[PDB]
Curated annotation (Swiss-Prot):
Subunit record text: Component of some HBO1 complex composed of KAT7/HBO1, MEAF6, ING4 and BRD1/BRPF2. Component of the MOZ/MORF complex composed at least of ING5, KAT6A, KAT6B, MEAF6 and one of BRPF1, BRD1/BRPF2 and BRPF3. Interacts (via PHD-type zinc finger domain) with unmodified histone H3. Interacts (via PWWP domain) with dimethylated and trimethylated 'Lys-79' on histone H3.
Distribution of this protein across tissues and organs: Highly expressed in testis.
Full protein stretch here: 555 to 674 of 1058
Function: Scaffold subunit of various histone acetyltransferase (HAT) complexes, such as the MOZ/MORF and HBO1 complexes, that acts as a regulator of hematopoiesis. Plays a key role in HBO1 complex by directing KAT7/HBO1 specificity towards histone H3 'Lys-14' acetylation (H3K14ac), thereby promoting erythroid differentiation.
Subcellular location per the Swiss-Prot or TrEMBL entry: Nucleus; Chromosome
Protein name: Bromodomain-containing protein 1
Cross-link Glycyl lysine isopeptide (Lys-Gly) (interchain with G-Cter in SUMO2) residue location(s): K41
Residue span, Bromo domain: 9-113
Coiled-coil annotated spans: none
Chain's gene name: BRD1
Length: 121
């Protein structure tokens, strides 16, 4: 139908905007600490601690399949990256500290993303 096409164009445009959001958030991780899944070869107990791992490569795969229906779903995954790290790693670690900085700097980007999503519809 024409409605299904219009809905698909809306999803495509959300995907475009989320891709720009993702790039901007990933720039706030210049050490690439969150770029890839935590390796289960190198951290064999990880899944005992963290039940829903996440990382920027995994979000990008989802994004490119148009698998985010709305900004809330995308933000859920970003928050998993931060929150998983802040539980697994102690406060005094470069990993924890990177997640705090990513959260703080990402807030600004996400605040405007929400306005754009609402504004453009």
């Amino acid at each position: 139908s024409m409605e299904q096409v219009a809905m698909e164009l809306r999803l495509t445009e959300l995907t475009r905007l989320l891709r720009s959001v993702l790039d901007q958030l990933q720039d706030k991780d210049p050490a690439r600490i969150f770029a890839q899944p935590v390796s289960l070869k190198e951290v064999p107990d990880y899944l005992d601690h963290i039940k829903h791992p996440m990382d920027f490569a995994t979000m990008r795969k989802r994004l490119e399949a148009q698998g985010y229906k709305n900004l809330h779903e995308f933000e859920e995954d970003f928050d998993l990256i931060i929150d998983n790290c802040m539980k697994y790693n102690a406060r005094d670690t470069v990993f924890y500290r990177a997640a705090v900085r990513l959260r703080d700097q990402g807030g600004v980007v996400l605040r405007q993303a929400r306005r754009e999503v609402d504004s453009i519809g």
